[PDB]
């Protein structure tokens, strides 16, 4: 059948199957996203005030973290020039102060765990248990109403309650999101693709703080979940990763023992040592999700300089280079499923076979389109409505390269024993913002694929 027909069948199947998932554990990063829609002249003026030469310097080479305003604006410009996503820790208090005064346009739920919780529980109706480092009033009320739960303790036993029911009022953890559209101008520079740069400005998610409830009472909490999605390790450094990693590994031991598939959402991990340590534990995960920037950063530490460069080229990055990169990652770690997403198409390399892998990708692509249009999804219907968004044209050539190289048919093929699944995506011409679309894509496909096996 045609791609349009495949999309249609996929959403109809998912609308029925997804709601059957009994429960999903989500951790560990949840925060408040302060989203700013960049303005050309405002940014140009600020770049000159900060020191333009330094700003340009950092737009050519991203720093490991942000300690100055020139580093912040230069990192934003880095993303603008390449039309690629990046995120760095704002270590400087003066810079965070500068960001607070600079402001934002809207406040939204942020973080892999937080965003996925609102989607799966708040929209899909799938019960979820989410880890929230700091449950401030603002944080709790950014959670949608529905089967979303956080663990608490009343007399030695776990009591699951909606975030809004939490009696405390902890700290507001803010991350600033700098969004820019395709064609955004800054002096002679022009954004080749709509994207954003993130300056994380809290001191809880950045150290991968994990609540007492998720420590040794974790077994009780996950008794009724069927899947788990973990993320947040991206902010750690060679100086503070040890302790958090041991907690995560303990959680993974419990999850693996109960045979609960776990998916890791990779994110921009600046510290090369931590990036390597994540790979060292990937074999404990059933699945992993990532974009072109993230896959490139992995190739970088694996010595694949060529693949890294190709994965950072203009959209759409070469699908063969991506597939070869995924093969290297799978062989190295033993992860069972790798879901790659980029602008124009998604790919999924799995050690097992099945059209349900491709169909789950199609479901996720529709969710991505809906999210791109409204900034936030309200219902499964909005996802179904996204079928009217045309499949992007450039994906035709991408599919052809894959067919010629691996012989994929209707998006499915095989390479070295693994199944390689491909789908051309539905790109929204004038998206509101880009932050969180990746999370929508990865979580929807992971839960969707699993739901298809029920
Ligand atoms: N205008 C758009 N329409 C549909 N999908 C989009 C659009 N802009 C970005 N995306 C998708 O959302 C993702 C954001 O990636 P990431 O920042 O890695 O989570 C990309 O990999 C694309 O698949
Ligand atoms: O995927 C979007 C999310 O990415 C990272 O988790 C950022 O820290 C967070 O601010 C953002 O909401």
- ∠ CA 199-26-15, rounded to 5°: 110
* Pairing label, strands 157-161, 106-110: unpaired
Span from the CA of 184 to the centroid of ligand 2 (angstroms): 22
Burial per residue of 46-59, b for 16 or more beta-carbon CB atoms within 10 angstroms, e otherwise: bbeebebebbbebb
Q: How far is CA 431 from CA 187, 269, 315, in A?
A: 23, 26, 17
Span from the CA of 395 to the centroid of ligand 1 (angstroms): 14
- How far apart are alpha carbons 276 and 288 in whole angstroms? 15
Q: What tokens does 213 get?
A: 């409830």
Q: Which atom of ligand 1 is nearest to the CA of 290?
A: 18
Q: Of 287, 134, 110, whose CA–CA distance to 207 is shortest?
A: 134
- Using CA positions, which residue lies closest to atom 8 of ligand 1? 434
- How far apart are alpha carbons 120 and 381 in whole angstroms? 14
* Ligand 2 within 6 A of CB of 275: no
Longest dimension (CA), the chain: 63
Q: What tokens does 224 get?
A: 């009724």
- How far apart are alpha carbons 261 and 66 in whole angstroms? 35
* Ligand 1 within 6 A of CB of 234: no
Phi–psi pair at 51, nearest 5 degrees: 120, 90
Q: How far is CA 197 from CA 35, 59, 97, 164, 251, in A?
A: 10, 12, 18, 30, 31
Domains of the chain (ranges plus CATH)? 1-30+111-171+204-454 (3.40.1190.20), 31-110+172-203 (3.30.1110.20)
- Listed resolution, Å: 1.9
**Active-site residue flag, 439:** yes
Q: What tokens does 81 get?
A: 């020039």
The string of DSSP codes covering 58-78 is: HHHS--SSB-SHHHHHHHHHH
Structural contact between residues 319 and 368, judged by C-beta atoms closer than 8 angstroms? no
Q: What is the helix (H) or strand (E) element at residue 129, kind and residue range?
A: strand 128-130
- Using CA positions, which residue lies closest to atom 21 of ligand 1? 342
Q: What tokens does 393 get?
A: 């044209």
Q: What tokens does 370 get?
A: 């809906």
Please identify which residue in the block is written with the tokens 């009022």.
169
- Using CA positions, which residue lies closest to atom 12 of ligand 1? 437
Q: Of 319, 420, 399, 438, whose CA–CA distance to 3 is shortest?
A: 399
Tell me the best of 434, 436, 443 to mutate to test the pocket of ligand 1, counting ligand atoms within 8 Å of each CB and taking the most.
434
Give 335's contacts (C-beta < 8 A, 6+ positions apart).
264, 282, 283, 285, 286, 287, 288, 329
- How far apart are alpha carbons 174 and 376 in whole angstroms? 19
32 forms bridges with which residues in the sheet?
Answer: 109, 174
CA 327, 445, 369, 85 dihedral sign is negative
Least distant ligand from the CA of 392: 1
- How far apart are alpha carbons 245 and 250 in whole angstroms? 9
Structural contact between residues 75 and 270, judged by C-beta atoms closer than 8 angstroms? no
- Using CA positions, which residue lies closest to atom 7 of ligand 2? 111
Phi–psi pair at 115, nearest 5 degrees: -65, -45
* Pairing label, strands 287-290, 337-342: parallel
- How far apart are alpha carbons 151 and 160 in whole angstroms? 5
Span from the CA of 436 to the centroid of ligand 2 (angstroms): 7
Structural contact between residues 316 and 395, judged by C-beta atoms closer than 8 angstroms? yes
What is the three-class DSSP state of 268? coil
Give 435's contacts (C-beta < 8 A, 6+ positions apart).
33, 35, 108, 110, 177, 179, 196, 198
Q: What tokens does 128 get?
A: 């979820």
Structural contact between residues 332 and 279, judged by C-beta atoms closer than 8 angstroms? yes
Phi–psi pair at 78, nearest 5 degrees: -60, -50
* Ligand 1 within 6 A of CB of 87: no
Least distant ligand from the CA of 345: 1
What is the three-class DSSP state of 61? coil
- How far apart are alpha carbons 182 and 190 in whole angstroms? 8
* Ligand 1 within 6 A of CB of 402: no
- How far apart are alpha carbons 131 and 128 in whole angstroms? 10
Tell me the best of 390, 438, 446 to mutate to test the pocket of ligand 1, counting ligand atoms within 8 Å of each CB and taking the most.
438
Give 85's contacts (C-beta < 8 A, 6+ positions apart).
79, 195, 196, 197, 198, 268, 291, 293, 434, 438
Structural contact between residues 337 and 288, judged by C-beta atoms closer than 8 angstroms? yes
* Ligand 1 within 6 A of CB of 406: no
Which residue among the candidates 202, 271, 359, 439 is catalytic per the annotation?
Answer: 439
Give 233's contacts (C-beta < 8 A, 6+ positions apart).
208, 241, 244, 245, 248, 264, 269, 274, 278
- How far apart are alpha carbons 50 and 58 in whole angstroms? 12
Please identify which residue in the block is written with the tokens 């892999």.
112
Span from the CA of 67 to the centroid of ligand 1 (angstroms): 29
| Neighbour-count burial of 97, counting CB atoms closer than 10 A to its CB (0-12 exposed, 13-18 middle, 19+ buried) | exposed
197 forms bridges with which residues in the sheet?
Answer: 86, 178
Whether cis (ω within 30° of 0) applies to the bond prior to 316 is: yes
| Neighbour-count burial of 174, counting CB atoms closer than 10 A to its CB (0-12 exposed, 13-18 middle, 19+ buried) | buried
Span from the CA of 111 to the centroid of ligand 2 (angstroms): 4
- How far apart are alpha carbons 235 and 200 in whole angstroms? 9
Structural contact between residues 339 and 361, judged by C-beta atoms closer than 8 angstroms? yes
- How far apart are alpha carbons 205 and 90 in whole angstroms? 12
- Using CA positions, which residue lies closest to atom 11 of ligand 2? 111
What is the three-class DSSP state of 339? strand
Q: What tokens does 227 get?
A: 């899947």
């Amino acid at each position: 059948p045609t791609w349009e027909e495949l999309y249609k069948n996929a959403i109809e199947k998912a609308i029925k199957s997804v709601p059957k998932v009994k429960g999903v554990l989500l951790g560990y990063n949840t925060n408040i996203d302060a989203i700013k829609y960049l303005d050309s002249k405002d940014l140009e003026e600020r770049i000159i005030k900060a020191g333009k030469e330094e700003v340009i310097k950092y737009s050519e080479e991203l720093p490991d973290k942000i300690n100055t305003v020139s580093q912040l604006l230069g990192s934003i410009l880095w993303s603008i020039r390449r039309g690629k996503a990046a995120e760095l820790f704002v270590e400087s208090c003066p810079v965070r102060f500068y960001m607070k005064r600079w402001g934002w346009n809207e406040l939204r739920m942020g973080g892999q765990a937080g965003i996925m919780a609102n989607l799966l529980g708040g929209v899909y109706g799938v019960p979820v248990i989410v880890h929230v480092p700091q449950l401030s009033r603002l944080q709790a009320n950014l959670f949608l109403d529905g089967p979303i739960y956080v663990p608490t303790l009343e007399n030695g036993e776990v009591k699951l309650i909606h975030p809004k029911e939490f009696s405390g009022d902890e700290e507001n953890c803010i991350h600033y999101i700098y969004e820019f559209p395709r064609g955004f101008r800054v002096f002679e520079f022009e954004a080749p693709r709509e994207n954003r740069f993130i300056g994380s400005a809290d001191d809880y998610n950045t150290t991968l703080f994990i609540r007492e409830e998720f420590r040794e009472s974790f077994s009780e909490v996950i008794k009724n979940v069927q899947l788990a999605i973990l993320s947040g390790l991206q902010a750690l450094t060679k100086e503070n990763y040890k302790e958090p990693f041991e907690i995560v590994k303990s959680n993974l031991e419990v999850l693996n023992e109960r045979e609960i598939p776990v998916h890791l959402e990779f994110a921009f991990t600046p510290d090369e040592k931590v990036r390597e340590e994540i790979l060292n534990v990937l074999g404990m995960f059933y699945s992993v999700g990532l974009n072109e920037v993230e896959l490139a950063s992995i190739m970088e530490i694996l010595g694949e300089k060529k693949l890294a460069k190709e994965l950072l080229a203009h959209d759409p990055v070469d699908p063969i280079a991506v597939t070869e990169a995924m093969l290297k990652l799978a062989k190295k770690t033993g992860v069972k499923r790798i879901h790659f997403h980029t602008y124009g198409y998604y790919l999924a390399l799995t050690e097992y076979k099945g059209e349900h892998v491709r169909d789950a990708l199609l479901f996720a692509a529709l969710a991505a389109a809906a999210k791109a249009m409204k900034g936030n999804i309200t219902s499964l219907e909005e996802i179904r409505e996204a079928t009217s968004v045309p499949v992007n044209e450039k994906a035709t050539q991408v599919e052809e390269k894959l067919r010629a190289e691996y012989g994929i048919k209707e998006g499915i093929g095989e390479v070295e024993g693994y199944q390689i699944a491909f789908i051309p995506t539905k790109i929204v011409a004038k998206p509101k913002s880009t932050v969180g679309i990746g999370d929508t894509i990865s979580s929807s496909a992971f839960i969707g694929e699993f739901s298809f096996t029920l």
